[PDB]
Each structure stands twice: as structure tokens, then as C-alpha cells.
Design a protein around this ligand. Structure first.
Ligand SMILES: COc1cc2c(cc1NS(=O)(=O)c1ccc(Br)cc1C)n(C)c(=O)n2C
Ligand code: NI
Length: 118
């Protein structure tokens, strides 16, 4: 059943998806369209995959969730050249999503997980 952590992470994940209006990070990179993607990228990640893990209650804490978000960003910045729509979108999401994640971390530290999740 339902931990304050899952309640918090549901909110945080939707706030992160709210920073991706193009849906660039919403679903896995297609290996059919980009057949060399995994040559380069060991741990693919995207928001749908994070949601599945979240709903399976597979995150121990906020840090583990943040690490998956960081994979999304870091994979994109590794795979794509700097002068691309993908790289620019990853930088913007790193910036805007970072604000969201830092706020969540500080709220948990300030008022506790139970209160922060509510
Ligand atoms: C969600 O679709 C993709 C996301 C990414 C991605 C590739 C795709 N999928 S895709 O089939 O190549 C694609 C490319 C351009 C458009 Br417009 C739409 C899709 C689905 N790459 C190389 C990334 O770094 N990202 C984040
Ligand atoms: Ni490793």
C-alpha cells in the first residue's frame, strides 16, 4: 500500500513532465528509429519508465528518483551533439527540472516527508 514517498514522487514526476511540452522525454528513445542508441547508452531512461518504477514502488527514496531523472538528462547530452534540438531540450529540462527537484528535497527536509507529500 501507499507511502508518503510515492505520493510525493507522483507529484514531482508530473511537475517534471510539465517541463517537457514537446514530450521529448515522455517515452523511450526508439531503437528502431535510432539503431545505434544503445551502442553509446548503457541505461536508457524516460518519464514513462520512471512512472512504471514509481507505481511499482521501486524507489527507495528521493535520491533514487533523482538518479533516474539525471539519466534522462545525461544520456541525452551524451548521445546528441550540442547543436541539436535534443541537447538544447535536455539542458532546459536539467535547469527547470532541477528547480523542481531541489524544492522537493528542501520541503522534505524542512517539514518531513508526510507533510511534504500532502
Ligand atoms: C521520444 O522519442 C525520442 C526521444 C529522443 C530521441 C529519439 C526519439 N525517438 S525518434 O523515433 O528518433 C523521434 C525523433 C524525432 C521526432 Br519529431 C519524433 C520521434 C519519435 N533521442 C535521440 C533523444 O535523445 N531523445 C530524448
Ligand atoms: Ni554502471
Amino acid at each position: 500500500r501507499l507511502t508518503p514517498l510515492t505520493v510525493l514522487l507522483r507529484s514531482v514526476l508530473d511537475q517534471l513532465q510539465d517541463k517537457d511540452p514537446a514530450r521529448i522525454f515522455a517515452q523511450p528513445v526508439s531503437l528502431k528509429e535510432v539503431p545505434d542508441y544503445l551502442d553509446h547508452i548503457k541505461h536508457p531512461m524516460d518519464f514513462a519508465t520512471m512512472r512504471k518504477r514509481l507505481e511499482a514502488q521501486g524507489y527507495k527514496n528521493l535520491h533514487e528518483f533523482e538518479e533516474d531523472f539525471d539519466l534522462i538528462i545525461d544520456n541525452c547530452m551524451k548521445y546528441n551533439a550540442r547543436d541539436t534540438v535534443f541537447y538544447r531540450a535536455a539542458v532546459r529540462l536539467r535547469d527547470q527540472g532541477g528547480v523542481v527537484l531541489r524544492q522537493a528535497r528542501r520541503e522534505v527536509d524542512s517539514i518531513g516527508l508526510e507533510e511534504a507529500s500532502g
